[PDB]
Write a protein that binds this ligand. Structure first.
Ligand code: IHP
Ligand code: IHP
Lengths: 220, 220, 220, 220, 220, 220
């Protein structure tokens, strides 16, 4: 992608084969865990919209997610076009006007236009907008691909509380609810669906008990 | 290949063995899916025609498709020679003669000649044209190695709609239809080739809903 | 992370895929053993808080420890906010106010703010404070994942004392005890919970001898 | 090999061990397939005959082919010596006479001699000629390695035409006959030795066609 | 860490994860053999005391050896403090006093102090002192881990003398003694504790021959 | 090691960890074979003697060969001391006297002396000489693990001729002798020790037999 230059501006460079190999490995090993969402921001720093398009295309299978993200990109491009004032008239030499939905998506914009937009004055980070749209698409796709809800988790009589609370927090992270709702569910459902023995132990522990005390109490 | 040197001008470089090894391993481990076409453009950027020829030559097996690509290269070179009259003029330093059909593919041109063509003023990315030429072939190559039709696709009574839409979009990517034709064909056949209960539910929902409602309407 | 340009000004770079891939693979493979605590500081030196929280988020599984460390980070940030004399009123131009309880976590502080803090006059090592908080959280996590206590280790009648003292010192490294108590216990517990013949040999050898004499006298 | 300087003068570069290790491991792991013939050039660009000799000597297994290629190199060096007699006379400063029969084989010469030959104007392509001789030796080796002829191939009744055409083209590539007769026979023998259904479809198509049409007609 | 730059002054850097991963894996997999002592010196070139401490602490298990080497480091630091003059009072600005016994290990001295000491004129090779202390600790732990002495090695009645001489030399390399003692042992003990037939053949061949002649004398 | 600077002066470098890792892996995995003899030289294309002995001491096991090569190094140092008289008197400033028998091995000379000798005018390839000394030693190392002679090889009736000729050439290449004896034996032993059918075929073929025709006539 675009790499920094020693005491210089930002110039475009070829995509590292290591980056794409790591991306295909991580999207072929699990491809449906929340931690792959930060991984995206660990590799899409400063990348051109063309790089985003190539990364989206290089994935194998699961084209339903590709259609989902394409639809979200189209609708958000339309909303950006309607909200942002239209640009016309003589364009200043050396720079280009604010790109429309087609240009930011990379379908009609070449590499030179994206490079000029990155080095604009003031710089226009439409790559950031495109990747935040992709982040929203990833959020909705991980909502889609989550195979369980939050309220249906139940701890088995022989099931340890360790992996129980682990999967509870995994589904909590998969949930898109507000912070206060997350706090309420983590304060209630963590005991509403546990084993009865240490359920009553935690009830005896009183309200607002930290989870370390609960985990040291549910043992045995 | 030719890479943009930091705080300096671009210079020719030898092909890294790792890129070729990754290319050959991904060719031998994966079928002729559409997503391999962008992957090629993720490794052939800033490459001389000789580099592209070497990349083509490292193919392991499936030489029938290689013969198809060679024939398409020959016919495209013939078309290029036919549409470009022979450029006759003085030969002086700083000016290089017009490459022919055997020269764009790099079969009869040395690496130094390609470097001189790249450094010629004005720059001639004719080798890049050759790249797109092979891309064209790769397109039909996919259509050759995914012989399953798109009209005959039908979701079985026990076939989940997730895999149904996955294979439908795989064959769509294998298809040569334009963007609008693809959109129309999907918006028709997705509801035309579903389970009867899904058909009734989605027709009760009505047209205009995105694929999200299509998925969430007839779950199970 | 943060690097110094050769004969140049300070420049902030991204995270290389090598470091994150190695960290995630070693975390997913190796358990929550004490040796992972130094390993983190091997790869998280001079890193911005945003890089630290992205590295934290890229982990997969064991979300109970993640929730516990988030709680500890939040409470420590609140304590830092209340104890520190939070400046109020106007801020002079060209300055940067003290980090917030959420700015140190990186969830509300932009990368430009982090860069300004790093190069501030005088510099603010907020990233180091966050790293120390992470170190405390990892100590809590390794205490949580401690298999057994330290007083229950018993030497087998025929098991060699070599692996006995090895696991004793491993558990000492995994122990939550302070400095003076561990100094007291490293001179009396090992000679008290060994085979009787070697115990009496060590007792006759005299107190104050280092562990090399202990192991040589205990040789069979 | 010998690499160009960053806007400077030609400087010899050290041999990368990774390329040699990859070459030897792939040669010893997969096969003695003719696919090594082109990719060898990708690993021997701008390399002195010493580097080629070092690469050749580090091979493992099947020393009979090594003896064959050594004998071919010796006889071709003798041919070069007898066709082009050894030059005599004092060597003017700044130039150097052509390499001898042993010098061109990279045996009785040092790296500095190759550097002086390369910097000499015109540059004598001793390395290129040695590479051509190695290519001819490998062509003879792969001619030997062929376990069957080209005219005895027959297609099984219970086999798809894809494997038949694949093996026909791989054996055609493995052939060392003249290109003219090869291209003449690749349009006839493929149907002269095909299954009856392909034969009937092709003779219904009529004499003369492109292999794309042939292989699409064989489908179904 | 301390690594030279291309035609430029040395700048601070960080140890690559692959180096530490290889170091820890070879430490945990091969042995606590003397050959690891040079290996460490291969990976400790231009390394700050912080890097040395991190590389030391990244090992998993064998904590008894870690405690032993820490104790030897502490006693060596005490010896250095008592031997080298104890500076009292600050020095003129621009210079710093010699690092304390706790500063060589890096327990109390930060990386900035180590960098300042390294760049100070005259240079402070405190890292070299720490490395040689680690070398002494490795030598003593190798001597500890030797399962047998050099005096009680007996050749098997049917075991070939190749394995006998190999194990004799391997044990000798683990011996911490002068080179003259090693020469005397290799010249005397190699025949004293051998099989009667090789003993008689060795005595017939005389004591003036080298190891090669005597090992080729009584083969079988 | 010895690395050329970009159009600059000669600058010393430390040994790359990957080079020594590859060396030790190929030594431990692949048995002692002549093919690894070039593998050493490619890994030692310019290095100080200190680096040579450092990479030589990394190998674990087979210490008998290490002792043999150390003895040969000592005897070659004695030879160098005898043939090259020791010189005394004044030493020119900026230059160092020629290395002695102990200095070439690097046992007494420090890294600074090696650097000064590398940059000496005229250059002193003392380390190069050292490497050729090692070559001599490894020659007799080839004689160590040779299990049979060059005339006891026999082709079994059930064993294919390919394996027989492969082993014959392995033993021929491994064996150290003159060129004339190899030329004599490459036409006598192989025919004499072949299965009777193709042996009499070769005898009917007569003189001038080449291995290619030899074992293409032996097919069947
Ligand atoms: O291509 P990069 O991502 O910049 O990584 C390179 C690459 O190593 P890898 O292919 O293993 O990643 C270099 O190898 P070449 O491409 O030159 O063959 C290597 O050079 P050496 O092989 O000589 O060590 C260099 O290391 P360095 O920068 O120390 O010269 C290393 O860079 P990193 O070590 O920063 O990944
Ligand atoms: O550490 P791993 O996860 O096993 O990956 C390694 C590593 O490659 P990366 O540095 O890209 O991770 C090796 O490089 P080093 O760490 O030894 O420098 C490389 O070896 P080469 O550099 O010689 O290519 C090797 O490849 P191989 O297993 O073919 O030897 C490759 O393994 P993977 O290819 O399985 O990732």
């Amino acid at each position: 992608p675009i790499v920094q230059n020693l005491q210089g501006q930002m110039v475009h460079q070829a995509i590292s084969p290591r980056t794409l190999n790591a991306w295909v490995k991580v999207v072929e090993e699990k491809a449906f865990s929340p931690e792959v969402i930060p991984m995206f921001s660990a590799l899409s720093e400063g990348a051109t919209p063309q790089d985003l398009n190539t990364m989206l295309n290089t994935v194998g299978g699961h084209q339903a997610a590709m259609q989902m993200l394409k639809e979200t990109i189209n609708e958000e491009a339309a909303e950006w076009d309607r909200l942002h004032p239209v640009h016309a008239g003589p364009i200043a030499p050396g720079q280009m006007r604010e790109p429309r939905g087609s240009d930011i998506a990379g379908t009609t914009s070449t590499l030179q236009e994206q490079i000029g937009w990155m080095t604009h004055n003031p710089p226009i980070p439409v790559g950031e907008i495109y990747k935040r749209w992709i982040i929203l698409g990833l959020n909705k796709i991980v909502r889609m691909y989550s195979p369980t809800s939050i309220l249906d988790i139940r701890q088995g009589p022989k099931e340890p509380f360790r992996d129980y609370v682990d999967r509870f927090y995994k589904t909590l992270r998969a949930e898109q609810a507000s912070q206060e709702v997350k706090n309420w569910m983590t304060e209630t459902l963590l005991v509403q669906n546990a084993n009865p023995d240490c359920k009553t132990i935690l009830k005896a522990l009183g309200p607002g008990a930290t989870l370390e005390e609960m985990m040291t109490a549910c043992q045995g």
